[PDB]
Amino acid sequence: TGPTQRHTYYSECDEFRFIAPRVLDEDAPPEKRAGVHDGHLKRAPKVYCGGDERDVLRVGSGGFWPRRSRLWGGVDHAPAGFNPTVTVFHVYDILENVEHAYGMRAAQFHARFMDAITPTGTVITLLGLTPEGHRVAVHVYGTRQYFYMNKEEVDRHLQCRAPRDLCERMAAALRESPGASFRGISADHFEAEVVERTDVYYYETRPALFYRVYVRSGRVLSYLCDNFCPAIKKYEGGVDATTRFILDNPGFVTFGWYRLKPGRNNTLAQPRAPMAFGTSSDVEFNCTADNLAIEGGMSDLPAYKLMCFDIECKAGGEDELAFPVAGHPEDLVIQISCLLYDLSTTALEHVLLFSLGSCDLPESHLNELAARGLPTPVVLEFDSEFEMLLAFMTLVKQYGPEFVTGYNIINFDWPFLLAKLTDIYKVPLDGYGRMNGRGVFRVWDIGQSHFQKRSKIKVNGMVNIDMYGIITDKIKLSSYKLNAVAEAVLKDKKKDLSYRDIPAYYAAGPAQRGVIGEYCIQDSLLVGQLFFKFLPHLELSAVARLAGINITRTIYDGQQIRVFTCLLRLADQKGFILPDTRVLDPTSGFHVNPVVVFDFASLYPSIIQAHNLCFSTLSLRADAVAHLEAGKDYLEIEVGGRRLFFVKAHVRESLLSILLRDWLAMRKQIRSRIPQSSPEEAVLLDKQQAAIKVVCNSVYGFTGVQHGLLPCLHVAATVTTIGREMLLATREYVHARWAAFEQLLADFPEAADMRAPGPYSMRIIYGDTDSIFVLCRGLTAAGLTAVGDKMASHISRALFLPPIKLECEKTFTKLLLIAKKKYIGVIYGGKMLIK
Ligand SMILES: [Ca+2]
Ligand SMILES: [Ca+2]
């Protein structure tokens, strides 16, 4: 029989391109020791380990590397009678795929699943682990993408009388498509219904009737959205099936624990037979969303595996010291270190070294690892680059680490490996992720950042977290070379074997290749220490849970999608649908009198809340607000020369305001629990509160991106305009209320002994986007941070609407103002700060 859907990774191989350095032939005379061999060879790829020899692709008892694999090439290697009961499972990632009833006809799927994919359907696959550490895939059927179109606009254009007709028109349009890739589509592939909704833009916008159109496929949806009737605005055609699955099932998360349960008519999840598995899992199920519930109370991460890896390459052209280029057949990967950790316990479980050529690790290294209590390295030796790279990808498929890390693996190691596998060898990669074929496995190097030469990676079912990104984001350093970072962060100074050394070491023999290997392993151990110090997976999963997107999109997609998805949830609840697209300048100088610094706390979010700014509260038209009282019911403000109106919360509440309010409440609840929490809970709660802060701080930016997911440049501009007005108001208030010491003392009598011998004055000397510096001649610094707290409260109360909050941040005893955003000063505690 064999698998229902073909496995595309290699499970057999009998011929391959053999490329190896000739220096590995110490049996050859000296003139024949330079360059690489490069020829075809007709034998099975092999690996050598400790005197034994195996075929790379053979699966059975005596393998050289660990496996967490049930099927291999369509043979079921599970023990006889393997049949674990699954109740709860953890989901770390979610895939979207199309299945076709016809293609699945000989998989014994129950009828309710077949109906969902007749003739085609989107299947949401939840990937994860049981408590027992079994790898699971749960295939959810019955999620449809949908978009909206204005009913009046559609009827007037297409002469539609009823939803049946619209379905005919869309079916017809696809039939007639260029390239004909929708032959066989009928008006049965669509369902249209009439609903009442409101466009999220502008206060005056009335509710209207829309067609809501359900589609079975993302491919069909993307075509309709950019081809069908381009004069008719579409709404929410950009929303993926995963998002509909998450938002349409209250409580569902993209990362967390679930339980299988009975569905509506006591339906049950159906276990798939092994030959119908779509992924490299131990167990697979078919279900609908009603067979799933969130499992509250479960919070511990299951035993996911982390692979930390690093490659070493050897340029083999005319210059041994040239940077290696993957397209050059002679520029080889020569080693790969691969450390496998349990992500729940942080324990290092396996230390693997893949070596092109024989490789004898130094006894000193082996003794050191033993002393540190770490696993004894397994050295896998190979005769050619292909055999080695195939073994590494074989390990990736068979062990299936859910998380992968390294240092600069996104910009160097993965691109280099995948360039060799695709361009030199012609290995398809689409079965090397979690899916057994047809899965995403792609790197794309990205533009604009042309100097930094950045990249993204997507590998289905694998979360790649590059520690270089984590550390450049999190720590300020002069150099982000791994050795410099290991000194700065781990306080773990170590030697560098330089790239200049590698060619001479490689050529010497197995002992010196062993020195290369030691240094490659030490590289990966350091990265592992960095990973387990910063725990970036806990940060990223916190954001994924909050934003309703998978952890993969959390890493690689930008800030906008986070806010968008949260907005989409709220907007739907409220009946909206989202359409598819000088006096503050510093006079430079040195001040020896104290300079108090007042900062607004989360200024832009606070403005959005305080002034009820939103897409939905804005009007560009005075007649929109003619029924309302000025001041009492709306804010009128000039922004870029236009008059804008924003109605107040009692007229209509801002969606953005609701999001921010609710997040800030949630962050307050979390930060209140941290002091009573146990130390592991404190780590999780800390990751959660931090995730909330990043999403809140992204709302302003979300509104200001022209050509973004849902721009409202009017909101963005209003925020900066109110910002500027607030700083000026603060300056004016300070200049007026506290021009004399008597007035200061009258408000704060603890000032009475802070009075220094010099003349009293209080003046704003600098102001940036959210802070103001106040020069307090005639006051001593000592009590001034306390009086500053009270000045800040006082101003906040006098001038501004909650939740706007001015705070006294610090006091400089001495300060050098250089320019905008450039200053040096000493804080009252004696510490120097430079910006
Ligand atoms: Ca690396
Ligand atoms: Ca390296």
Number of helices: 22
Q: Bound small molecules, which ones?
A: calcium ion
- Compute the separation of the termini in Å: 68 Å
Question: What is the correct CATH architecture of the largest domain?
Answer: 2-Layer Sandwich
Radius of gyration: 31 Å
Helical content class: 25-40%
CATH C-level category of the largest domain: Alpha Beta
Number of domains as seen in the coordinates: 5
Strand fraction: 25-35%
Largest sheet: number of strands, sense, barrel closure: 7 strands, mixed
CATH superfamily of the largest domain: Ribonuclease H-like superfamily/Ribonuclease H
What CATH calls the topology of the largest domain is: Nucleotidyltransferase, domain 5
The helix/strand class is alpha+beta
Secondary structure: number of strands: 36
Q: Give the strand order of the largest sheet, numbering strands 1, 2, ... along the chain.
A: 15-16-9-8-7-14-17
Shape annotation: globular
GO biological process, one term: DNA-templated DNA replication
Family: Belongs to the DNA polymerase type-B family.
GO molecular function: 5'-3' exonuclease activity; DNA binding; DNA polymerase activity; DNA-directed DNA polymerase activity; nucleotide binding; RNA-DNA hybrid ribonuclease activity
Keywords: DNA replication, DNA-binding, DNA-directed DNA polymerase, Endonuclease, Host nucleus, Hydrolase, Multifunctional enzyme, Nuclease, Nucleotidyltransferase, Transferase, Viral DNA replication
